[PDB]
Design a protein around this ligand. Structure first.
Ligand SMILES: [Cl-]
Ligand SMILES: [Cl-]
Ligand SMILES: [Zn+2]
Ligand SMILES: [Zn+2]
Lengths: 373, 373
């Protein structure tokens, strides 16, 4: 297999379906990536993640650098060996979680220093150090290090952070390219910034394409703006990116967000919703989400979802899972999470098949009618 | 298969190895039963419990009657269907946990009333009601309802509780026999009482054998007395029980307790140690227990145990499991528990094979030399 090859097999409107070939495996697109926080997709063995249909998972650099540590993971053979997942892994840059989770942060044109939220130890991230940590982990897809822009942002602040992000994108590119083993075996994605402002999004797209990346994320969304605004920004933002590379919407999201984002040209997604919502008692079904803690499920012998092909829905009832979650049982988290990840993978499969068959627009309409009935 | 058939295939001293045939499966003895508290062996799917080698699991009647409720489980098809374990299940009577976990208890010759530790709701147990709840759950091996005797107990109190327990054993026998479906498809075990007093243990054994049961537990041990005293009581207590029926030591225990109890004629065991200790970070190995949280394992690439055949030791390192447990990750509880239950099943298999080959005494000596080195 090549280091990186993205091939589009079929299109319908702005939607695409195809494959990314990498050394550790093939990724079918549109793709959903389960989130593997600190070297575990919570409550699942990696074989179970694979069994649900996932081709690639995400790792959180911020969490991994704090515990167990990036150099330690490298000493132990890399993230794949450590956690037992041998297929591709995408790592974020760590910068977003520094902003949202750490303390005592000091930002500058060079990078950021911050205090761990676990024990107050001091740490640093920069374009160079982020790329280096992602190398130490052995990541297959490396995200450039950028500067997040809060929602809402003024035009001036959005421009300043977008401009810095583009300078940091060049530094990330150069750091990645200077490390032979990383440049030859991994891929590097850049992140478009610019908030809700069309002209900034265009400048950002132009700058990233001039540098050149293996894929392009739409950054700065899913941070408080609401679905209407997110879709409006995607409407004009995704067409600015190179058509022949993957388009990644970071941190999205709900099933209906994913469908609408594919309709607007997105190829890749990640979200903690199926895992985190699952542990809290929310199960996704084709008839919308349900809260399994609700007393109406206490004697319900049906599976979580009537059509789902996952092993949980083959074997256990709503009534049983209701009991487990109410009781705080680990198996409740395990079963809810496996079903939710499998549901998300079945959604991506139906999206891929409907695009290949030229009936995705109808699928999206039917999906929404039933999901929101 | 018959309702119940115990066959001894080989003997060495007081130790025996053989099989219990029941309608839902064969149990190899000496047997270890993982504990399935409130309809889950914590952090394991039932298929994983089976994969480690378990032939039978235990259910806690006290917990099940509080949550999700005995009548509810019956409405839903019984415990086996509810939790997805189709092999034999042994249920305790609930009486011990009333004593140790509930509040506001009022005891009498008829039974006990008590307040739930979860929500203060009032409940009742008696010989008749305990047998009935165990029927509602669909238990394959039913424990008679007895009265626990704290350690230490005076001769007078030990005698009074043993005498009541024997009256309650007759009431349990009669309740079980009056329910056609239960009498024809399940088995009933009686519990010897009498504390550390040889004459009381003899009176208890004689009374239970006159009533007649499918198996006999040695009750009142593993409650604070220490291994020397426990072994001393087993020395004279087990020979008093009918030789041709299974001998069950409830709530035991550590690997070395199990080996010594088999040397004294015990055929069946249950304990929360492998599951509960596992979640807390203790792993059992042939070289003794280890605390995986200890900093010395942070970069240890070896498996938990160098010989263990379990899937955890095939696939993940001490270093990884150390990280998971330190981080509070659900997968840490999952992997530690699977290894510990598998270790216990491998111990029982080595015990069974060595008895069949007439070399159990040597195995016990070798086991202890290495386990305590
Ligand atoms: Cl999560
Ligand atoms: Cl437990
Ligand atoms: Zn399912
Ligand atoms: Zn093992």
């Amino acid at each position: 297999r090549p280091r990186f090859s993205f091939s589009i097999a079929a299109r319908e409107g702005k939607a695409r379906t195809g494959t990314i070939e990498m050394k550790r495996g093939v990724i079918r697109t549109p793709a959903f990536m389960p989130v593997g926080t600190a070297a575990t997709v919570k409550a699942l063995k990696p074989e179970t993640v694979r069994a649900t249909g996932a081709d690639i998972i995400l790792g959180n650099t911020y969490h991994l650098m704090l515990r167990p540590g990036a150099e330690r993971i490298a000493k132990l053979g890399g993230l794949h060996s450590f956690m037992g997942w041998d297929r591709p892994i995408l790592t974020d840059s760590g910068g977003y979680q520094v902003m949202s989770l750490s303390s005592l942060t000091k930002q500058s044109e060079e990078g950021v220093t911050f205090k761990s939220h676990l024990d107050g130890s001091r740490h640093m991230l920069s374009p160079e150090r982020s790329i280096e940590i992602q190398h130490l982990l052995g990541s297959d897809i490396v995200m450039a290090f950028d500067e997040s822009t809060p929602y809402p942002a003024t035009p001036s602040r959005a421009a300043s952070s977008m401009e810095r992000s583009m300078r940091w994108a060049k530094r990330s590119r150069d750091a990645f390219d200077s490390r032979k083993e990383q440049a030859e075996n991994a891929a590097l994605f850049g992140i478009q910034q610019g908030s809700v402002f069309e002209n900034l999004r265009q400048q950002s797209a132009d700058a990233l394409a001039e540098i050149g990346f293996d894929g392009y994320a739409v950054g700065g969304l899913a941070v408080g703006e609401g679905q209407d605004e997110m879709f409006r920004v995607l409407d004009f933002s995704v067409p600015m990116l190179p058509d022949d590379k993957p388009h990644y919407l970071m941190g999205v999201g709900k099933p209906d967000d994913i469908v609408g984002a594919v309709e607007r040209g997105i190829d890749m997604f990640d979200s903690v919703l199926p895992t985190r919502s699952g542990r809290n008692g929310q199960a996704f079904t084709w008839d919308g989400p349900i809260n399994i803690r609700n007393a109406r499920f206490s004697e319900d012998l049906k599976p979580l979802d009537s059509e789902c092909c996952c092993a949980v829905c083959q074997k256990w009832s709503r009534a049983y899972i209701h009991h487990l979650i109410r009781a705080g049982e680990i198996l409740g988290a395990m079963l809810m999470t496996e079903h939710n990840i499998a549901f998300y993978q079945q959604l991506m499969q139906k999206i891929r098949d409907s695009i290949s068959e030229g009936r995705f627009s109808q699928f999206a309409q039917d999906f929404r009618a039933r999901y929101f009935a």
